[PDB]
Design a protein around this motif. Sequence first.
Motif, PDB file in Angstrom:
ATOM      1  N   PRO A 205       0.937  -1.140   0.040  1.00 54.41           N
ATOM      2  CA  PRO A 205      -0.116   0.029   0.071  1.00 54.41           C
ATOM      3  C   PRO A 205       0.896   1.237   0.106  1.00 54.41           C
ATOM      4  O   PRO A 205       0.726   2.153   0.961  1.00 54.41           O
ATOM      5  N   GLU A 206       1.698   1.406  -1.138  1.00 55.11           N
ATOM      6  CA  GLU A 206       2.637   2.502  -1.122  1.00 55.11           C
ATOM      7  C   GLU A 206       2.645   2.961  -2.439  1.00 55.11           C
ATOM      8  O   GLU A 206       3.170   2.648  -3.412  1.00 55.11           O
ATOM      9  N   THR A 207       2.383   4.334  -2.460  1.00 54.63           N
ATOM     10  CA  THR A 207       2.626   5.213  -3.761  1.00 54.63           C
ATOM     11  C   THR A 207       3.924   5.514  -3.987  1.00 54.63           C
ATOM     12  O   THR A 207       4.993   4.860  -3.469  1.00 54.63           O
ATOM     13  N   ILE A 208       4.385   6.451  -4.878  1.00 56.32           N
ATOM     14  CA  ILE A 208       5.706   7.033  -5.179  1.00 56.32           C
ATOM     15  C   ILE A 208       6.673   7.333  -3.736  1.00 56.32           C
ATOM     16  O   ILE A 208       5.976   7.570  -2.883  1.00 56.32           O
ATOM     17  N   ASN A 209       7.814   6.814  -3.717  1.00 56.17           N
ATOM     18  CA  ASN A 209       8.662   6.578  -2.604  1.00 56.17           C
ATOM     19  C   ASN A 209       9.183   7.820  -1.985  1.00 56.17           C
ATOM     20  O   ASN A 209       9.768   7.781  -1.164  1.00 56.17           O
TER      21      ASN A 209
ATOM     22  N   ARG B   9       7.671  -1.008  -6.210  1.00 59.32           N
ATOM     23  CA  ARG B   9       7.644  -2.234  -6.643  1.00 59.32           C
ATOM     24  C   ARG B   9       6.451  -2.749  -7.097  1.00 59.32           C
ATOM     25  O   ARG B   9       5.915  -3.034  -8.287  1.00 59.32           O
ATOM     26  N   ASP B  10       5.485  -3.020  -6.006  1.00 61.02           N
ATOM     27  CA  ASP B  10       4.119  -3.229  -6.195  1.00 61.02           C
ATOM     28  C   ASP B  10       3.194  -2.530  -5.424  1.00 61.02           C
ATOM     29  O   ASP B  10       2.134  -3.206  -4.795  1.00 61.02           O
ATOM     30  N   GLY B  11       3.055  -1.276  -5.723  1.00 62.98           N
ATOM     31  CA  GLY B  11       2.400  -0.393  -5.091  1.00 62.98           C
ATOM     32  C   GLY B  11       1.334  -0.127  -5.973  1.00 62.98           C
ATOM     33  O   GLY B  11       1.065  -0.156  -6.932  1.00 62.98           O
ATOM     34  N   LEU B  12       0.465   1.080  -5.431  1.00 59.85           N
ATOM     35  CA  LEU B  12      -0.659   1.688  -6.277  1.00 59.85           C
ATOM     36  C   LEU B  12      -0.148   2.287  -7.570  1.00 59.85           C
ATOM     37  O   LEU B  12      -1.035   2.470  -8.454  1.00 59.85           O
TER      38      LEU B  12
END
Lengths: 167, 79, 218, 220, 86, 51, 86, 151, 148, 225
Positions: free
Chosen positions: E26-30, E38-41
Amino acid sequence: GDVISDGPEAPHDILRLRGVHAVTRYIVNEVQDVYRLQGVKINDKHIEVIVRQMLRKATIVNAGSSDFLEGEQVEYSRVKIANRELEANGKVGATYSRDLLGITKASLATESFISAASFQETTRVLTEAAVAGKRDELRGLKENVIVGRLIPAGTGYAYHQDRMRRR
Amino acid sequence: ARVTVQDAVEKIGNRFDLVLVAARRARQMQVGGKDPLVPEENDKTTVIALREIEEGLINNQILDVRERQEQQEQEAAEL
Amino acid sequence: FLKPRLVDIEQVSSTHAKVTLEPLERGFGHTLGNALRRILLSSMPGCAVTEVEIDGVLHEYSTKEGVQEDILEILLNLKGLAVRVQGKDEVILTLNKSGIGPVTAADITHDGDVEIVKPQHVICHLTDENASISMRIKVQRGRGYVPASTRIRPIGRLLVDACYSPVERIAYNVEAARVEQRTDLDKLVIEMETNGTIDPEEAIRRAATILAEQLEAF
Amino acid sequence: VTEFLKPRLVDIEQVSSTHAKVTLEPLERGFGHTLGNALRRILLSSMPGCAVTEVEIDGVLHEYSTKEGVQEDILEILLNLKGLAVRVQGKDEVILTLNKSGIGPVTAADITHDGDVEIVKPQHVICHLTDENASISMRIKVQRGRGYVPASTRRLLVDACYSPVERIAYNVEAARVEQRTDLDKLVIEMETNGTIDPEEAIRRAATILAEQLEAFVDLE
Amino acid sequence: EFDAIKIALASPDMIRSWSFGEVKKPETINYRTFKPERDGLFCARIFGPVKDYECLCGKYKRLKHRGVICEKCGVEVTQTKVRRER
Amino acid sequence: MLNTCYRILGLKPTVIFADQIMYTGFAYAARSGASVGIDDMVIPEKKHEII
Amino acid sequence: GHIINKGEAIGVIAAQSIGEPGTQLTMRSSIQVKNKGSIKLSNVKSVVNSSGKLVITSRNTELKLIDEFGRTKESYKVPYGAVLAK
Amino acid sequence: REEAVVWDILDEVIREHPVLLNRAPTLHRLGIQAFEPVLIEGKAIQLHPLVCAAYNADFDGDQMAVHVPLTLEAQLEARALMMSTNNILSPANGEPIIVPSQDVVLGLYYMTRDCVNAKGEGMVLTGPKEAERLYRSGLASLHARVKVRIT
Amino acid sequence: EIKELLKLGDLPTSGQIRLYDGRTGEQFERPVTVGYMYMLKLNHLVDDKMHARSTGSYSLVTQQPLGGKAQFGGQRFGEMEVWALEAYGAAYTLQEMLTVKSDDVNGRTKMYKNIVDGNHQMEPGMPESFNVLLKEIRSLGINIELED
Amino acid sequence: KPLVGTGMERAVAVDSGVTAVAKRGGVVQYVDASRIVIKVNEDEMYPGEAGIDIYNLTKYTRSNQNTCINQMPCVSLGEPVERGDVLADGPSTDLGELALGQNMRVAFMPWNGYNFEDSILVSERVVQEDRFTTIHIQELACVSRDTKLGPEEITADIPNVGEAALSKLDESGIVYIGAEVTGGDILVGKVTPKDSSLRVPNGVSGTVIDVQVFTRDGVEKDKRA
RNA sequence: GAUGUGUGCU
Ligand SMILES: [Mg+2]
Ligand SMILES: [Zn+2]
């Protein structure tokens, strides 16, 4: 149709007792009274048009040689064409009782779930359209605007007729 | 010069087919190389087409006949 | 027909005068009077301030320590300066002044070929014992009204809207004349009000010259 | 600063002769109305010509009567005479006679010639007769003057319309030189009574106007 | 090009059919060098390349490679407009 | 008058007639100075008595 | 000024016409016959009274004043039990 | 840089190219009409007085929106369907919608009216042109009572 | 008292003088009301309201022209103006108002090229804001699609 | 001033504060375009530190609506004032009396349809006299943020620009106070390490009257700053 | 870009 009491009638009683021309005459004279009082001139063609669009559904009385349900509220044009093709054969048609719906129920109850969904109560329409597995034929003026092609109204009329006769 | 389209509508009696016929003719004059059938007075292609429809010497049937004739001519010259 | 002639110029004040044209045939008082009124109000040649350079001033939305007025109010008072440059059609007057008191137009060190017609015209008031303005007012000749935002450089030169026009009010009146044995002959009294920088007779002669020069199309 | 946009007649578009329509541009700003109205005021009411001043008919001595057998009323014969456009040579005033009889229209071609007195409209109708015995005859005194002189100001009297311009009406609109914002464009629309041509009466009016501006023009 | 619009419910197999991947973190741009996770929204691998005709890892940069799925991050070099369709 | 020009003479004479009506009403309304002052709202002499 | 051209939206120029004057509308005895002519009783159900005149016994009755030509010129509603004058 | 040649080039891309003029609440269809443009100096969209009734547009500060019909059929629609000339009846009733109002009618009323005395109240004119020649010269009052000869 | 004060000047007590026409020099054939009114200049300036746009920047998610005057944005052909184009019958003006000079990104640049090529002709597509709707409905559990 | 007032102008234009109003009576000692000095009557001075009082007028500065709020003195040198009477006028007051517009000479008449519905036909002398000319200041901003690839500085080194563009900028990169700019000109030079300079919006003229720089701490300064 | 608030204009 004669009065057993006094008061203002509701134009469903007028419809089912005194007929359809009685309720068009009623609605026309009434809204024209409201306008004429303020000195507004509106020809009656227009109010007869909106009335026509308020009389589109039709409940079924008895099926007969047709395939509609008993109390199913089918459109009036489907009934008309089905019975006109049955009487073309030897069978016997179906008897119907005209309905009359307000301009807000005669719009949500039309045959395209894109017109209805873009008019009002979007979720309530997409739900019933999704479970009934409906299908929209793209045929009014608003769906051809939403999608983005020519409305079938002016010059788009010639265009759409060519396109429809191409199939 | 053009202001009112009443005569052109009397010739092609629909005012919705008038638009389509005059548009076909104007796109002929504009994209295609065809020249006006009436002496232009520094008018644009649309007004020239409307003025042709008014003087009588163009409509949908005339346009279709010219198109078919010239298609057959081009095919004959193709050998 | 008869013909009108400038029979009297009653210069009542330094600014406004009354010229008189007689005799004028019937129905010509108004023709000539209104053609001349419109031509005088519209097209007379004048001089007007156009650019100003006050010494330590960069823009017109600022003030100068010592003077009682913004530079904008100084620019307006200059824009109302009546000057009558004589030989050229562009001159640069130089105003230098120091010490408490008004700064009238008389404090302009003007040349021989320049005439300030209203020397009492205030420009700005110096209110300090050691405060001095030194400006370079560029007057030039023109026509009509030509704003600063329509003409055509340093960050000193301020531009003022130039109203090159000497006549402020023109009136005309038509009244019967006394010709020895004739009636139905008029007389045209053109009561004009310049700002001083033009001559009534020369005003009427320029007006008539412009009118006839326009008629020369035929 | 003394150079103005000097116009020139762009076109002299003429509807059926004596109905010309001149346009001159690009006239300086606001000069449309000075020029248009000066020429209009001159053409309309200060411009020379001849016109039927008075008339005496043999068998009537009062404007409200009727000569027997004549279709029109004298009140309408006077109208039919007011429109009689006529050119006279060096004489200042002359008299014409209209002796005629017989069923039919009495037209201007039925007046005695009188030499140099010329009628521009021989098809102009003056009165209709209704009997082979009906004979009409009149002495029309035509005279030279300036402008328009009604009869209330002045042997039946006729409103003498001395000047030729029947209707002058300018109309100033906007036109542009290559960049200059808005100039004028004078559009004059003149009709005359045939006794003069419009594109010539405009020049006569301009001459009349110019000659007034000669005592005090700069000759520049 | 098309003459009707049909609506219906969606079966889990059909929802898997639309999808181009699976989202599990559950993680957008870092909040760093601003690249999707990797496998975020957001994800360059699942949804598409962030910059037109360029991988995410930086191994390809031109049109000539159009269509090749990268090996480091599996971001098939293609248009970026496919991040509004996938 | 406009509505009868439209039905007797068609559309083009009416579109030309409407502009003429406009220009010639504007001209002769300006040419009349038809202003409004305070002495134009004239109070009746009988308002005091009625009230 | 002619019959309606085939193929043109009357359902929109109808609703626009019925809805444009919306901003102009607000939001918040005895029968005196007026003109010369005859009288007609629609759906008569009446009886002569001892007063010599007629009394009406049907609620839907209507009183029509007809012109001498034959056209209907006035129409009033007459209640139950109303005595006439003629 | 708006050289002096991107004018009349512009006065020619504008010649017979209508533009639509829409006023904010488009209550009925007369609220979009296509006019031919005339290029004016300024920043206000000058709008013929006789279409204000249809638009329901006074000039106390309301704004209009120009749209440009690009394609060729859109120009022939804006000219053959929407041109402000083609709309001199209302679609709501057979009533006119080009109705002169409020100054065109005070002018036509002040002109066409009589006063029982005037500058010239007897004279018998000889046509409309002489009536104008007399009024303009100040020899008759616009309200006089004359006998004109009209055809 | 107003009339007394006019008399204390030397002006006509009726408040109305006889004005002359400035450009034809003759009287307005009536006395007109001339006086001094205190006028205000409301700050609805016109060079704060004049705006025009041929092409500018377009929005991000729904590829339509931006709004307002600061962003070089375009007027909103609203929902009520569509009914005024449907009423007229103008089915081509409407199509170009909602396809070419608006969402459809692929046929919006072909039109720019056609226009600056001497051609005036549109190859219209599907408004990229219908595909956004399809994706937002298909991103509920609702399979909406186009048939053939 | 309004010729036809109501008498409530000297209250509205005094109680709203725009105007510089005397605190203690006295005699004016020095009047400049941007300061007034009142020598207080000793009847109103305190026991200690008698002195005077000084009113710094608010010269051309910007209001919330991007207009000019600007006080100018309505007194003159050597002239008595008493308590609570205006020393300087505010924006749109005249001698301490509200004045929102101008008194212009109206004629109520139709004029060829140029005042047709509600329109107004203004003479050309009303615009020659510059009497409805208003003044409107507007601040444009340019912030220098530390993006990636290194921060962004305000230097004048601008690539891919003619010299006419960099002609108005000084060496530090910011425009000269007093430069008559127009649409498109460069006002501030800012560089993006790959160019996001601040430029005049479209069609807005002006004259640059005040450049104004802020800086956080550890960033040394620039000569301009 | 989204949303909210406020003002204003029709
Ligand atoms: Mg309004
Ligand atoms: Zn990679």
